[PDB]
Every structure is written in C-alpha cells, then in structure tokens.
C-alpha cells in the first residue's frame, strides 16, 4: 500500500497558518510581515486583553490586509466556561509530591495565590466535591486529592505529583456533577462584540455536546448567522459526542496537550488520528492547535525534532496549523511563520487523492442533496479529463467547501461577490478566492465575466495553459468542462 | 454474488426488436401491426429481391410510421462477398455420407444444381484449392473433401457427413488463400441505393478486419457519412480481429449458427458471451441475430424451450433481437413480435447497473474526451440523487449513446432536431427520442423549450412526479440536476 | 470483467452425467456401454415398475461396474406425494380451448380416462376446491377452471387453453389448502427397499420445506443415515423455502420445465441462475434435470440448438446433468451420453476459480468449524504454490466435498476405505476416488501407504510429474504441501 | 477508513526494546534491572571501548540472563567505514556562520582539534575534493565550503552555517567520488571477535548497496553464517538501493536524524514511513534508532512531546525501538525502559491485521516457496477459526519469522532446540520462545512433547483456555488446527 516518492508538491495543497496576535505582532507593519510570511488567519485570544485592545487588532489587521491587497480572516477565540485557577504571587506555583495545600472559592485570594493556598473561580466547588475526589489542574498534569473541608469556602488537599503551574489554569472535575453553561457571561458579551465588529469566525471553547453549539449560535443571533463556529474539543465528553458535534459545527480545533484527563498521554495520538479522519470524511476543516516549534520563541532556527513534529501533524491530515505565543509574544514572529509554510508545503508529499476521493464518496448517505451530488461529480470529471484547475462560482462559499471535501488533484478557484466569503475561505485547504465586484463590475447572469475572471486567475498563477481542461460549477445546479483558450 | 428477485422490470430497459420485412409484412397495414407489436427497426434483406421491391418497403414503412406518428429505422442488410452455392432442382440437395459429387465454376449449372453436380460462384475455385482440402458448406454443417480436378472447371468431391442443403448457401474455405473484396460489385450498387433512398444503417456482411469497415464507408461516401455501419461477424477472422472492428464500427451483429467453421458448436456460447461483454464495455450495441422462436412461423404459441432460449440471449446482455423468416414469410407476424417483447421485458430481471456502471468507467482510457467525461459524470449523479430520468439534448445522438454506455438505472430521453437521429436511436436500449421541430418551433439557444419538452415527455410517460430529480445534458459540455416542477 | 479464450479444459472439471435406466439400458452389456460413454450415476425411476424390476437394475449395474472395475452410484428417484391424473384411453387426451370437461375422484375412471371425463388421485378434491378455482395440469401448461360440483365425486370444468396431455400427469392446486404428506405410503415402502438394497442416494420429490427433508431421513432411519438426500424443487413453496432446504439437504435437483405454476416461463431462467449460485456458495451439488438433447431419442446426431442449450446449462454452473427417456427408452443410448460428455467438457471454458474461490470464502460465517477452515486453507495453498493436484484422505468423504466447495484449479483425489464413499462421490464435480482396501491392505495410521496411493494415482493420470507440488489433507485436522518424488 | 477505539492492547503485540550498554548499565545487577524493565536486546557500540570492555558486557549480560532464567540477545553494532572528524580540545567546537577554518589529513591534529583547525580521518581528502565543494559534518547539520588547498594536507574552508559540534562526527561528501570499503579494517577485526564470542546479530553501519551486505557476510565467514545482519541506512545511496538491501539482509535500522544530506529535514518523516512499509511487506524487522525520550537522561519523568514522539514511531509500524545514551550513560536507566514499554504497549491501539494480512499476501510473488505458502495459510486459519494462539516448531526460527510476516491476531509461540534461536527471536514482534532441551529431554519425532510444551506455555500465559483453538506448524511442511484440552 503506497510506494511513495519525494518530488513535486506544488504551491497550493499546502496547509493553512493561523497566527495569534499579541504585543510582537499587533502593529500594522508586523501584520504585513505575518501576511507576507504566510498568515491566512489572525486569531484574537479573548481570555486576555480588553475590548479596546481587540478593537485595535481588528483595525490593524484590516489596514495591513488592504495595503497588501489581500483578504485575511479575523477569528474570535472565546475564553469559555471551563473552571480556572486564580493567579499566583510569583511567576507561578511549585507543587511538591508529598505536600498538603488549600483551595478557596473566596475572591479575596484570586490575586494572591500561592503554592500553599490558592483560588478557583467555581463559586460552588465546596458543595459539589467530596473527600477522596481528584482535582485535575493544568491539562490534568498536576493532580490533587481532596482531604476535607476546612470551611464553607476552603478545601484541604494533597499534591499527588510534583509539577510547577502558572497563572489562571484549567481545572477539570470528572467524577463531579458540574453543569457548566455552554457560554459564560463574559462569552455572551464578547460574542456581541464579535457580531458588531464583523468577525469571520468564532473558535468556541469547551464544547462537549452538539446542543451546546446551538447555544453559541443562539448567542450570535440573526446578525451572526453567517459567522462560522469552530468547536474546541478539550475534554472526554467532547470526544464522546464528536459525531454529533462535527456535522453540527463548521469545524474542529484540537490540541495534543489540551485533550483532558481521561485520555492518557500515549493514547492522545490515537485520538488526533481519529478526529482528523472523522472531519475529513464529513468534509469539515480540522485545526491542529498543538504548539510545535516552541523553541522559535527565542531562536531564529528550530530543531529537527520540532520539524518532524509538524511534518507528522501535516502528513496525517491537518488542514490548519495554529501559532500561539510564538507569533503573539515571541522574538522571531516572521521566521516562525516562514518555517511553518515550508514544512506545510514540503511535508505534504504522499497525500493521495485519486482513490482517496472515491472513498469519501462511498461513505456519504445516498440520496445526497442536489448541490453535493453536483460537486462530487465535478471532482470525478477532473480525474477523468486529467486536468487541471477548478472554477467555482459561489456566493456563500458552501460549494467551494463541498468540492474541497472531495479532494481533487487540482487547485480550486472560487469566484465570489461576498468579501466575507474571501476571508472565510482561508481555513479551507486548496481553495483560493477571486473577488468579483458586484457593484462596480455589475452584470453577470451571463454568467460570462466572472467565470473568465476565474480562468484569468488560474492562468496567471501558472495552473492552466492553452490546451488544458478546466471544470466549472454554479451550484446552490450546473457543471461545465471547459477547454482553455 | 447477486441475490436476485423476481418483481419489477418497468417498460423501458427492454431489448429492441428488429423485423425482417417479406411477403407477410410488406403491406402498410401489416407494418402498422408490426410497429404496434414492438418493431423498432425494419430490416431489408438485399440478398433477395429487386431494387423495386425494396423501394416499396421503404415507402410502406415510412407511410405506416407516419400514420402511427412514430419513427421507425430502415436497415439495409447487404448480401456480402461470401462465396455461395448455386440453387438446386428440388427444394434442396440431399447429401449422403459415403457419396462422391462434383462442384463447378461453370455458370451453366447455377440454375440446375443437384446432389450429384452443383455450382459455386467463385470463378477461381479450381486455381486455389488442392486435393485433400475441405469445402465447408451451409455454416460448415456439410463438409466435402476435394479428390481431384475433373477439368479446369469441375472438382471431384467426397461427402464427409450426411446433411440436406437448400438454395444458395455460404461456402467457407479455410486453408485456402482467398482474398475476397470487402464489398462485392452488387454491394457497391446496393450501397448507392441505400444512400440515395436515405436509409438509417447498413448491416455489413462478412467483415473480417477493421480495414474492410473503412472500405464500406468509402463506398457510402460523403453523403452517407451519417449512416451507421453495423458489422456482421461470421467467420474466425472476424472473431480474431474483433477489438479493432468494434471500436471502428457502430455496432456488431452475431448469430449462434452463423459463426463459421473454426468455432465448434459447443464453443459458440463462449464466443457469444465474449463478444457481448466486449461490446458492452466499448458501449456499442450488439444485435443477436440467431433465430429463436422458429416454431412460430407455423404456430400461434411458442415452446418453453424457445422462450428459455430468448431469455438467456436477453439475460446475457443482448440489446437487440432480430427476427427473420418469422416476420418475413411467417404465418403469425404480429404474435411473434408480441412474444419477443414480453420475453425481452420479463427476462431482464437481475440486470445490475449500480456497480456495473462503475466497472465500465474503470475500464476506459484516462484521459477521456471532454464529452465522454461529462456523460459518465452525469450517470454518476443519477445514482447519487437516486432519481429518476435523464434528458439529453443531442443533435447527432452521440451523447445519448455515450450515456447509455454508462448504463444508468433510469430512462434516458433524448431531445433532437434531426429526424434521422430519432430513427437511428431505436437500436440503443433504454433511450427514447423526442423530436423538436427546429423549423416550426424555432428558437432554443435558451435552451429553454426543448429541455422542458423532454421533461414534459418523461412526466407523461409516468417517470417523473413533482419532487423527483432529473439530470440534463448539452454535450458535444454541460450538466444540470433539475428538480421537477 | 473476464477476457476469456478457447483452449484448454483438461479431462477433469467436466460436469457429471446421471443416466435413467430403462428397457434400452437395463442389460449388463448396455450398462457397460453407458459406463464407458460417461455414466457416473444410474438413476432408478420409482414412479414406474415393480420392486422386482428395480432389483434387476441394481444387480445389473453392480455386475457391469464390477466387470469394468469401477464404482457407479445407484440412485432411487422417488415417486413423491404430488397429486396426479389418471391414465387415458388413447395415447393421451386432447384438450381444446372452449371445451367443458369433468374430473373425478372415483377410482373407477383411473384406467378409463378421456378428454371429456378423467381421474385425479386426490380423494378429497371435492372438499377443498371452490367454483372459479384453477386446476393446473402437466407442469401447469394445461389450465382448467372449476365451474360446479356435478356430484360428491365429480367437478364440472372449462378448458382455459388448448394443450394435449398424456398419462398420469402432475396436478398443482395453488389457492387451495392441500396439506400433502412429505412422504407418500408408496414412498414409505420404497424407502425401506432403498435402505435394504444399499442404494447410494434418494432423489426426493416434491420437497417444499426443510422440515419435510427431516421426515425423509426419519423414514430412512438409523440404517439409512449414510444415504444422501437430494431434494427436488418443483413448486413455488420449494423456491420460497430454498435457503433452509439447501443447507439441510445433500443437494438440489431442478428442471427448467418442472418448476411449477407461479414461475412464468420467462422467469424460469432467472430461478435456475439463482438456485445454482445458491448451491455453489453453500458448496452442495446442483443437478440439472431439464431434458436437453431430446431429439437424440430417435437421431444419432443432435441439433446445434440442443448443443447450445446444454452449453448454457453447463457454463452457468451445473455440476450434474441428468438423462431421462434418452437413456431409458431411446434408440441411441450410448451416443447421447457421449455427446453430453463432450459438451460437459468443451463448454466449461471460462469457468474461473482464482478469485471465485476467494468470493465463497468471504461469504461463510466466521468462526467456521475446524475441518472447514482446514480445507479452504488447503485450497489457498494450491494457488500460492501454483500446483497441481490434491490428495484427501476421507472416510465419509465430507472432506472431499468441503474442498470441492472451495473450487481449486487442480484435480482432487480422495483416498477412502469405504466403497460407498467411492460411489457417492460421483455427483461431486472435479473429485476422483481411490479405494484403499482396509481389510486386505491393512495398516495405515502412518498414514504412509494410502497417501502414496493417491500420489501414485495422480501421477498415472498425468497430473503430477517429478518436481510438482501436491497438497494433502487428513481432516475430520492436518494439511501438508508435498514435493513429488 | 478505520473507526478506531481505545480499549484492549494485550501484553504481546508490543514493540521490542533494544538497550545500549554503558557505564550506567554494564553491571550484572543493572542488567537484571534492564531485563526486568523490558530489555530484549543488549546492544554493544563498537565505535567506543576496547575488546576487553565488550568482553565484560557479553559476560555480564549472559550472567544476568541466566540468573533471571531468560534469553537476551547480544548485538554487535559496528563502527563502520564512514569518514569522521577528529576530537576537539574543549568539550566540542563552536562553528560560526561567517568564519573561515582549516581541515587536515595530518594525524598530528587528531587529538588536538579546535574550531579553527581540526582533523578528518580520510587520508586522501586533498586529492578528491575541489574548491567550491561542500563538506557536510555531523549529520550534515554543519556545512562547510572548500576555498583552497593550504597544502598537500590542509584545506581552507568557510563555515556556511552556525552550529556547535562535538568529538568524532560523521563527514559526508556527496559530489565527491569516494569509494569507501563496505567494511573497515577495524570492522574486520571486530567481526572476528563477534564470531568468536557467539554474538546473535551485527548492526552493520553505512551500508549503501546489497553487494556490500554480502561483503559483511564474507567477513563473518562459515562460522558466522547463523548470525543475522541488520543494515543501517544512513545516506542517500542506501535509500536509493533499499529494495535490494532489504531482501538481502535480515533487517533494517533507521534513525530520523541519521539519514544523510540529500534528504531535507521535512522529508525525513516521508522516508521513515516508506522504509517501514517496505520492510513490513518483505516481512523483515525495522528498528527505529531515532533517540526519543532524551530528557530522561537527567529526569525521572519524560515530556508529553517525547511520549507522542514514541507513540507516532510505534503507531506507524516500528517493531523495535533502540535506546542509546539513556541506558548507556543516563541517570535513570530502568525508568526509561519502563516508559518505553508502557508506550510501546499503549500506543499500539488501532494496529489492524484482519485485512492487513490479506494485503501482504496479495503482494508476494506467486509461486511462493512451499514453507512460505504453509505459514500464510496457517495465519489464514486463525482468522477463520477466530482463535487464538499459534505454536510453531522451528529450528532456525525461519518459520516463526514467516508467520509474523503475515501478522496474525494471536500470539505466536515458537518451540526450539537452538538456544541461539531463542535470543535471535527477540527482535521479532509478537513471537515468544519456548526452549526444548534436545539433549536432556530427547525424543520428539513424535512430534508429541514439544507441541504440548508450546500449548503448556500459551495456557499458563493466559492465552488459551479449554475450548479454544490453536494452530500448529512444522515447516522447513505441516499444519494442524488443534482443540485445547
């Protein structure tokens, strides 16, 4: 099975890079550097910083993008309802294996935390937890066991294993009945902002059921109905309910570290593998959020261990990689994005599509909807004609997504009148936007001009020469195989 | 493999019936009876009857068809260059196993033939054959062996096996170098007639090489370029060169009896099977010319042995059955065609197409031509949408053929401005014509009206109700999945 | 799918011939002629002739076989419980479409039957049937409709369609509640005889349920437990309950004619096809009892229509053909069996086994029994080693059957101490017996000698030369790949 | 494709651990700790240490193994002919991007090396290299460019990129004609030792052609004919000639780092993937030598990045992992081997074998040898019977290897009279040895006792209870499916 080689990998078919903006990269000029290095999506991290701060980024991103004549997606990454620790006096708190320590629901200790007594923001912890229970902190790396109630606000605990933990970390309480909301009050206000400022997508945190996804859309409301929702799978319950979450969302974001208590470290790879196959079949994008290339926060060149780490992530099927602190607070923002790009390009080698397409087709429920039947059939035509680019006229972009789903061995070029659609398509691998100005240009029930606009593009990008074939779609339902002029 | 049932088989998907016109059926009224019983094609047999006779049939067929408001194809079945015997004094000649007899190239004995001395129309036989050689007569059923030259015109022969033979029978001479023309002088004049009288297809006789097919088209000339050529495979050399003959012709006609010397009786089934698969893959029609239901030349009801004979022929994959003497000189012309119809319908049972289509697709040479890629992809869309009829706008009909090739599980409805195309489509299983009057109707670069004309038809024939899907093609290259109104 | 050729077909892999003994062939000398022509099984037809008559055949068969030094199976073909007509004064009765006629349950008319009034042996017919019901006679070819009761013994009827019927024909009464026994009183006495005279197999008639098969074995009793039961499928109910009947019997016998009312003539082929696939998967033999080559009852040479008839029957997958009147009362008994043999040989051409074996393997229920797992695995080894004969040591022969089931591309040679097993293996295609005299020879827990006895045989029959591989089995569980000496 | 889960993974089917002995682990007691933690193979690294040192290890390993009553393989890992640097005055040499430096073939500088002038042991370097050429040092991480000859012994060079390098590192010279021997003089003497001291396998270094493998065996000679040769693929030429090297060796060892110049860092994963599939098909073991878990040289607990690193390595198909400095000179030798074991166990999850076996079978050249045909067929029997352990009687162990090749879903238990075979089987995944004392026990042409010895084992290890099936082999050719008592 598969006798691969090491040669082509053309410029398209590379994975997509999401950059987290921070002090290192908020400037218009730094953002121009990011865009030029390979940024497709600017990610805002709403667990930190005021609305004024994020307002600035939105402005800067838009200005940088406009200056470079490109469309870059802005993404609101929510804080989420997950229970967190307070902050600590030092840079952190140092936990020791034998030690006993205290945990409080008293707001007084939120800004005062220490290795001996610190704060947890779940104001009802005392009522839910019982002596003998395990409190898992910081991706369940540090484990505490509850000994007794010191008072109606404080719990006596033992440190199960040595580990050093920093400010505001995730607390997990399995074996405790905790019905946390789908959306926190802070999320509710942040989502209003997102809607009002015209963001492209929400990276929803701590989703564990499909029902909770609907809650997020209900918060976004009628005005936010065109905003995509990408779901973070972070604990066991999310993994448990993935099937329902996938086909009820617009994508999935997963992180090797941040997968929760009940998945042991060694079976984390297994889950990554499964979740990627599960998304690839359903045709929705999977964002690899695990932080590789961490050394490049202080170093201009990475390590071959980190290179192989990204390679595997890519080679396995990830469509998007996401950079955190490296772009947000790191020393070499541009150099990081440039290596990602090269690795996302060069580590795509064996990625099959010829029989890979026919496998996804066999796994969809017949009878499929008319527009989906169109798109797959079109991909079919590409392999049959052995050529060579695709032109899709799509307003909401749904048709471009549907085609990508059936992974053709040629570039997909979407032609759109919605500027939002240009941006939102960044997180779809192997698809490129061509904006057609519905106002300034005008007429095209032809639909002459905008098709030619696609072919004009593909030609200039070096995809199609005179004599090549090109497959065209106008679905909601039309298909055409076109000889290049 | 295949757990079949016995239930549906709707009206389409039945094989097509070709009727040989003769004294019993030349009348306009009898032809109306044939059309109503199930005739798709009137076949003229040019080995008999003057041009005046065949002129009459052509006229009658056209008048019968017009009166019933239908399009029936007229087919010229050539005599061919195969060497034949003379005629005999009795009804026949009775050959006896021990006997010695004489064979002449002297025209004097052509109308005088007898069991003891008869005529062969190969004026050069004496020069080619050597003592010890076998002369095979009447489908190689009677075998003679040459003993000596009696003179420069007559050969002394032994009867190898007892058999009774009638007038003008086929002579085969393997182990003798005989370069017979692709086309006889009589064929040359008959083909002019065919062209001048606007026939739909030639049933070319004794084709043994692809090169000979080109000779037939050269005879038909520029005016006859739209006339289809169906090739008769009758001897070993044809079977040997089938691959080349198939994809260089418009179809193949084969007869269990008439397959020649070098294929033993028991390995005749094997050949039938092979030739049918070979055509079905190349997408061209195969006409089963073997005469089943012979008893119905004198009887109103057939025998269950003959019923099972046709069944097998159909169930194996034949697209057309052909009736000879039963329609031409038989007592019950209508009743024969009616049983064929019922058997061609009811014996179609298990005929798969779901994975059968995907097998033919896998066997075509990539990269296929744009119009072929379109048609297969369209068939693909039918199964994906699970519905329900096809509308193809085709001028020469090539596109309808290409779709049939990929055997969809729905009826194909062709819309055409060429009246010739209506006729020529009779020999394609599962395809129906809708004539669109280019002159009287007029405008349709829309191409609004004629598409609706197809859907109008499919609706009335009971294929498509409100809510069903229908797949549409305008290839040479367009495809559309359409919701029924 | 399948690009066949016309070349090999070695002597094994031919289908097996069953001959019906009658006046033409009861003599020891005629039976020697049959054996030499290709008879594997002598069939006795217990619907005719006294026990003394059948006693003679049994004796003659055994004497002929012993003289020629071979083992020929004797088969008791039961009369069965199906309702039959009486006999008629003439040679027959001539039924006419308009006519009215009378049917009696009065024994007085059993030997007196006529076109106007005749007898039916169901002594309760009057109580079961209602005016308007259809009586189907002679394979449902002649159809009557009941008009009224003439008396408590006679029914007034109309002839629905013209047909001529002879003595003692099958009556079918669907739409009438008739619980006929699994076994008639005459069957009960005949089966005792069968057991007492050491027959090899029963051809059980009119089986319509698996439960009825058990009734047949119950009649045969403890002494008859090694006698195989072959089930005749003759009506709709048998076809309905086939799955259960197949895996509860030792084989199936089917006849194109004799399939019953509810299967129309054209859908008879469909059933043949299904039943053959159904048996081939379950690995049990299917006997084609339909009478082809009927003309050879009076003629030394058959017709190419009959040749193609047998060809199809064979090419489709039949393992046994059965001759009736042709061997029993025909003019040319030997010549018939000789043509069958040649057709069964030469019409085997394309019969695949390479991927055909792997399809049957995929369709068996895992986990299979140890001995079955052994046999299939052994067949697997043959293809892997590309050689070349199989030696199976089997006492009851079960292991030889199991191997045949997985259709290897080499001859199977069974070595057995049971002389009954030699005979019973005649109805298994591609398997040959080697008798090993347990008494006279003796020792072989080796199991040295008897394995060598198999290899000795295969070598002499021209299967294996020095250097070839040969696969050996002793299952109930052992397998060995052996280099030839 | 593949809807995995996270549950079973029983104790067998885990990958195998190879430990490099050094100061931390040479003691008998430390070796007992290694064996108990999961060591299957002690690896000696002959690029360091005198023969006396390695003599000690051999003794200690054997004593530790005997005390624990187990068989542990000893492996000689050769130094190899690859060109190396000298050593440096400091701990290392620090190379700087702009700098110019000098390289000498003068032995005087071998023990004196510095960042400005150091030594290379290729005494002919001056004659081969030309100005402008690139010298690649330390896995081609540091790159130099030749400027000129300073003298007949020294080259002037520029440092292409900053990197710090330590003692005696690998030098690669592509674009230079260097015919290095297959075996160095030091290798020649070391291989004599290996033979004389009864090692189990050689880990041959710097093999780039199949022809060179034969040279290694020629060095080992008649006495060393039972010693397995595992080939290190370290440069492009090895990768180029892999097909020939694989089926001409006894295994392959590969290291993510140590793959050479011409494979860029990002396309290293691609090669790993290919080489593992290539070995798995040919059925030979692949040793992953890349150093994961490096942090555990100084830390008791690893990092989840290293855990995921091993996971991928395992999950991809590696049969053996190899530990270097961690066991040789590390602080926590036991704890390292214990984590490997847990990761090699728990990260095996999805590893399919049901259809995975049938894919390897389809890719072997028919006709296969009798003994190979036996083994695959036996594996076939396991799935068919759904049970449950395998017992293989094998003298050289070849048969156990052949069975493993066809990856059964049950444990394989080999029974052997050769104590060397016990050891050598450690590097085969999923196979376990049972030693049968040919001298002390004695008789078994039965072959009763030793089969029972296998079943005795499987029962005690908890594989087989009363009622389970067990498949048995004595190939060179016998197979048996056995019910457990």
From Swiss-Prot, chains A, B, C, D:
ATP binds at residues 45-48, 84. The record marks 232 as: Transition state stabilizer. Homotetramer. Its EC number is 2.7.1.40. K(+) binds at residues 45, 47, 77-78. Substrate binds at residues 43, 257-258, 290. The gene is PYK. Keywords: ATP-binding, Glycolysis, Kinase, Magnesium, Metal-binding, Nucleotide-binding, Potassium, Pyruvate, Transferase. Belongs to the pyruvate kinase family. The keyword Endoplasmic reticulum does not apply. CDD domains: Pyruvate_Kinase (cd00288). Activated by fructose 2,6-bisphosphate, activated by the effector in a non cooperative manner. PANTHER family: PYRUVATE KINASE. It comes from the Eukaryota. Its cofactor is Mg(2+); K(+). Signal peptide: none annotated. This is Pyruvate kinase. It comes from Leishmania mexicana. InterPro entries: Pyr_Knase, Pyrv/PenolPyrv_kinase-like_dom, Pyrv_kinase-like_dom_sf, Pyrv_Knase-like_insert_dom_sf, Pyrv_Knase_AS, Pyrv_Knase_brl, Pyrv_Knase_C, Pyrv_Knase_C_sf. Pathway: Carbohydrate degradation; glycolysis; pyruvate from D-glyceraldehyde 3-phosphate: step 5/5.
């Amino acid at each position: 099975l598969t006798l691969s080689i090491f040669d082509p990998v053309a410029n398209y078919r590379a994975a997509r890079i999401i950059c987290t903006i921070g002090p290192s990269t908020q400037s218009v000029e730094a953002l121009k550097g990011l865009i030029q290095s390979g940024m497709s999506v600017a990610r805002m991290n709403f667990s930190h910083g005021s609305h004024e701060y994020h307002q600035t980024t939105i402005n800067n991103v838009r200005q940088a993008a406009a200056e470079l004549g490109v469309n870059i997606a802005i993404a609101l990454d929510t804080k989420g309802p997950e229970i967190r620790t307070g902050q600590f006096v030092g840079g952190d708190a140092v936990m020791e294996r034998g030690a006993t320590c205290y945990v409080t629901t008293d707001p007084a200790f939120a800004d005062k935390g220490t290795k001996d007594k610190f704060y947890i923001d779940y104001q009802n912890l005392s009522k839910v937890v019982r002596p003998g229970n395990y409190i898992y902190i910081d991706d369940g790396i540090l484990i505490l066991q509850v000994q007794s109630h010191e008072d109606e606000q404080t719990l006596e605990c033992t440190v199960t294993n040595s580990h050093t933990i920093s400010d505001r970390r995730g607390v997990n309480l399995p074996g405790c009945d905790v019905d946390l909301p789908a959306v926190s009050a802070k999320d509710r206000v942040d989502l209003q902002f997102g809607v009002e400022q015209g963001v492209d997508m929400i990276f929803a945190s701590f989703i564990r059921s499909a029902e909770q996804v609907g809650d997020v859309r209900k918060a976004l409301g009628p005005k936010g109905r065109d905003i995509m929702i990408i779901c973070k799978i972070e604990n066991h319950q999310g993994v448990q309910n993935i099937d329902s979450i996938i086909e009820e969302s617009d994508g999935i974001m997963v992180a090797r570290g941040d997968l929760g208590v009940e998945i042991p470290a060694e079976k984390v790879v297994v889950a990554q593998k499964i979740l990627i196959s599960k998304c690839n079949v359903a045709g929705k994008p999977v964002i690899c959020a695990t932080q590789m290339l961490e050394s490049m926060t202080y170093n201009p060149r990475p390590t071959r261990a980190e290179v192989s780490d990204v390679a595997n992530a890519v080679f396995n099927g990830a469509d998007c990689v996401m950079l955190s602190g490296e772009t947000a607070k790191g020393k070499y923002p541009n150099e990081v994005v440039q290596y990602m790009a090269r690795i996302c390009l060069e580590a795509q080698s064996a990625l099959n599509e010829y029989v890979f397409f026919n496998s996804i087709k066999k796994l969809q429920h017949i009878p499929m909807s008319a527009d989906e039947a169109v798109c797959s059939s079109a991909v079919n035509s590409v392999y049959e004609t052995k050529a060579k680019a695709m032109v899709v006229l799509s307003n909401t972009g749904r048709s471009a997504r549907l085609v990508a789903k059936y992974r053709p061995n040629c570039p997909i070029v979407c032609v759109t009148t919605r500027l939002q659609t240009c941006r939102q398509l960044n997180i779809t691998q192997g698809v490129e936007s061509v904006f057609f100005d519905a106002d300034k240009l005008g007429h095209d029930w032809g639909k002459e001009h905008r098709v030619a606009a696609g072919v004009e593009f593909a030609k200039s990008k070096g995809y199609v020469q005179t004599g090549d074939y090109c497959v065209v779609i106008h679905a909601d339902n039309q298909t055409r195989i076109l000889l290049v002029e």
